[PDB]
C-alpha cells in the first residue's frame, strides 16, 4: 500500500523549502507557496509522487534486483549508511569518483586490488613488512576504503539509484543518465524533475525528512526482499 | 496587434511549447476561434477556454503532454504559416496538399468556413490556404 499521512510530512521539514530568489523555474507549476525567504513545496503532488515512488521501488525489487544508494553530503553521510546496512544495499561512504558506474572496468580491477588488500589485511601478514609497505597499504587501502568500502558487495549495475539531493552528485546522476539506469531521487525547491525521470521533491534541510523518505524506502526495499 | 493576427496565435503556440509551457493566452477574434475550434477536435491540443480580463474575451489553451520524460511532450508540434500577408496563396481542389500523407492538416479558408483537408477534399471546393501544421 505504502502510505504516509499528510500531517507527518506537513509537521516536519518537508514544506520547509529553500531560498525564495534561487528557484529554478521548472517548479513554477509545482511549488505551492513562499514564506519568509523559504519556499513551500506542494505536498499533494509530493505524496502522490512518493506513492508512485514506492510502487516503482517495491515493484522493481519484486522482480528481484539489487538497488544502490549514493551517500556523500556529510550532512546526511552516516544516515545513508544506517539506511544501507540493514537494507542490504551497497552505498557510497563519503565521496564519489567520476566513473564508478560508466567506467566500471577500471573500477572492477580496482576492486580486484581492494579485495586482495582486504584479504591481506585480514590474514595477519600486515605486520611482516615494515612501516613503508604498511604505510602504502594503509594509504591506498584508506582511499579505496573511502570509496569502495561501502560497495564491496556489488558486481554489475543496479536498477534504481537513490541519491543525495541534487547538488554534490550531478556527476553520479549524469553517469546514471548515460547508462540509462533509472533513478528516483530527492529534489530541492530549485532543481530539475527532468534529470531523473521520477523523483521525490522535498526539502532536505531536515535530517528527519531525509530519515523519513529514506526510512520509507528502506522498508520498501526490505519488504521487497521479503518475497 | 502587430501586422498578423494569425502569426499572433501561431507564434504563441511555437513559443509556448518550445519552452514546454502548457498554457496559451491569446486574443479571441473570429478566425482564431475558428482555428482553435478546428484544432481542439483534431487531437493536437487539450482545451480552449474563453474568459475576460477587462471585458476582453481571451482564449487560454492547454497543450498536450505525456508523462515525465526528458521532455514531457514527445512529438514536437511544428506549426508553420503559408499564406503570408503580402504573398497570398490560393489552391484549387487539386493542389490542396496531403501533408506528410495525412499526418498533418492544412487549415484553409473555403467559402463554407475554414476546413481541413478532410473537410475540403470531400467538398470539392478550394480556397486560400491559411497554414498547415504537422
Amino acid at each position: 500500500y505504502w502510505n504516509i499521512n499528510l500531517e507527518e510530512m506537513m509537521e516536519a521539514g518537508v514544506h520547509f523549502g529553500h531560498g525564495t530568489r534561487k528557484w529554478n523555474p521548472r517548479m513554477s507549476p509545482y511549488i505551492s507557496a513562499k514564506c519568509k525567504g523559504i519556499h513551500i513545496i506542494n505536498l499533494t503532488r509530493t505524496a502522490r509522487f512518493l506513492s508512485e515512488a514506492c510502487d516503482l521501488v517495491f515493484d522493481a525489487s519484486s522482480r528481484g534486483k539489487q538497488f544502490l544508494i549514493v551517500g556523500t553530503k556529510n550532512k546526511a553521510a552516516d544516515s545513508v549508511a544506517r539506511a544501507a546496512i540493514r537494507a542490504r544495499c551497497h552505498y557510497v561512504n563519503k565521496k564519489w569518483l567520476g566513473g564508478m558506474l560508466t567506467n566500471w572496468s577500471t573500477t572492477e580491477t580496482r576492486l580486484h586490488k581492494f579485495r586482495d588488500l582486504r584479504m591481506e589485511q585480514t590474514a595477519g601478514r600486515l605486520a611482516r613488512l615494515p612501516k613503508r609497505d604498511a604505510a602504502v597499504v594503509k594509504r591506498q587501502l584508506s582511499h579505496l576504503q573511502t570509496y569502495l568500502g561501502g560497495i564491496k558487495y556489488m558486481t554489475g549495475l543496479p536498477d534504481i539509484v537513490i541519491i543525495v539531493d541534487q547538488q554534490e552528485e550531478y556527476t553520479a546522476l549524469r553517469e546514471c543518465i548515460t547508462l540509462g539506469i533509472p533513478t528516483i531521487c530527492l529534489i530541492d525547491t530549485n532543481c530539475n524533475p527532468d534529470l531523473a525521470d521520477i523523483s521525490i521533491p522535498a526539502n532536505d534541510d531536515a535530517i528527519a525528512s531525509i530519515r523519513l523518505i529514506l526510512t520509507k524506502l528502506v522498508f520498501a526495499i526490505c519488504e521487497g526482499r521479503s518475497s | 496587434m502587430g501586422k498578423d493576427t494569425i502569426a499572433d496565435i501561431i507564434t504563441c503556440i511555437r513559443n509556448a511549447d518550445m519552452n514546454r509551457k502548457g498554457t496559451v493566452r491569446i486574443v479571441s477574434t473570429n478566425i482564431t476561434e475558428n482555428i482553435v475550434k478546428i484544432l481542439l477536435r483534431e487531437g493536437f491540443i487539450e482545451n480552449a477556454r474563453k474568459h475576460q480580463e477587462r471585458n476582453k474575451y481571451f482564449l487560454v489553451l492547454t497543450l498536450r503532454h505525456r508523462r515525465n520524460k526528458k521532455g514531457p511532450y514527445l512529438n514536437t508540434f511544428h506549426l508553420k504559416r503559408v499564406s503570408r500577408p503580402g504573398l497570398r496563396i490560393y489552391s484549387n481542389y487539386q493542389r490542396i496538399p496531403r501533408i506528410l500523407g495525412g499526418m498533418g492538416i492544412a487549415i484553409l479558408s473555403t467559402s463554407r468556413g475554414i476546413m481541413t483537408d478532410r473537410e475540403a477534399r470531400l467538398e470539392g471546393i478550394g480556397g486560400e490556404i491559411l497554414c498547415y501544421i504537422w
Partner: peptide, 25 residues
C-alpha cells in the same frame, strides 16, 4: 543478453515514468 535486460529495465522505468506525471495527485 545483459544489454537487452538493461534496455528492458529502462523501458520499465520510462513507463513508470510514463503512467503518472499523468493523473494522479
Amino acid at each position: 543478453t545483459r544489454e537487452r535486460q538493461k534496455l528492458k529495465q529502462l523501458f520499465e522505468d520510462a513507463y513508470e515514468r510514463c503512467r503518472n506525471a499523468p493523473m494522479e495527485g
